[PDB]
């Protein structure tokens, strides 16, 4: 089996690039992401739209309530070995994402050391202002009102109803920013979808900055995968 590993920081187009290989090959893409295993935050965690998937399969390591906590790395790693191992007949698989903790587990693990052919791609953080431009665009996409999927702000207001979800959303990118933006201006979280467009731009900007901060960590704590 051939494993096509695509990894790198947030907003580096890794997802689209995975999808493209998946349409050409017919191979599933397995998301190397813990946060995306909570579908109640599908949009804000970076899950592609069903329309964007272009009929390819994208596999998550678990499907879980946000209030059960984000899947831990060692559990997600064990889950990942499983999704690969039972598909071992298949010609290939695409592993794509940016979970720092799960990539590091992959790098300590004997499983990946033998038994596979490999195509490895690391996307790198480029210049910051190019990064920010792409970050903002992405945030605006997640913010867009659609009749087929909740916005990030909608996902956030829905959960904010459940007190146990509150501590957990405050440790997640986009959400932490959005929560802090609301307190900063004395708005209720429920009220975040209804802000004037002037306040909307301020928030796109702040979330982008929180993405840059995260992409910078990804660059430090990412394992250097051998090519
Ligand atoms: N898809 C994602 N969306 C938002 N935040 C994320 C995502 N993946 C990781 N994070 C953040 O990065 C921190 C470390 O997770 P990880 O990169 O999976 O080890 C998490 O606690 C989240 O705050
Ligand atoms: Cl990406």
Curated annotation (Swiss-Prot):
EC number(s) stated in the UniProt entry for this protein: 2.5.1.27
Classification via InterPro entries: P-loop_NTPase, Tzs
Class of the enzyme per the UniProt entry, highest EC level: transferase
Domain of life: Bacteria
Catalytic activity: dimethylallyl diphosphate + AMP = N(6)-(dimethylallyl)adenosine 5'-phosphate + diphosphate
Keyword Phosphoprotein recorded: no
Record bears the keyword ATP-binding: no
Molecular-function annotations in GO: AMP dimethylallyltransferase activity
Annotated keywords: Crown gall tumor, Cytokinin biosynthesis, Plasmid, Transferase
GO biological process: cytokinin biosynthetic process
General function of this protein: Transfers dimethylallyl groups to AMP as part of the biosynthesis of cytokinin phytohormones.
Protein name: Adenylate dimethylallyltransferase
């Amino acid at each position: 089996m051939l494993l096509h590993l695509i990894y790198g920081p947030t907003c580096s187009g890794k997802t689209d690039m995975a999808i493209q290989i998946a349409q050409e090959t017919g191979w599933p893409v397995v998301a190397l992401d813990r946060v995306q295993c909570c579908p109640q935050i599908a949009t804000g965690s970076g899950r592609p739209l069903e329309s964007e998937l272009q009929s390819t399969r994208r596999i998550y390591l678990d499907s879980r309530p946000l209030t059960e906590g984000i899947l831990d790395a060692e559990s997600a790693h064990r889950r990942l070995i499983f999704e690969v191992d039972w598909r071992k007949s298949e010609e290939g698989l695409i592993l794509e994402g940016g979970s720092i903790s799960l990539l590091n587990c992959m790098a300590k693990s004997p499983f990946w050391r033998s038994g596979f052919q490999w195509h490895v791609k690391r996307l790198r953080l480029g210049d910051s202002d190019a990064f920010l431009t792409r970050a903002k665009q992405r945030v605006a996409e997640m913010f867009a009102i659609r009749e087929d999927r909740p916005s990030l702000l909608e996902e956030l207001a829905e959960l904010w109803n459940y007190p146990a979800a509150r501590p957990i959303l405050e440790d997640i990118d986009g959400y932490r920013c959005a929560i802090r933006f609301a307190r900063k201006h004395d708005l209720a979280i429920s009220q975040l979808p209804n802000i004037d467009a002037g306040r909307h731009v301020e928030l796109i900007e702040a979330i982008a900055n929180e993405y840059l901060e995260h992409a910078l960590s990804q660059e430090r704590d990412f394992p250097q995968w051998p090519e």
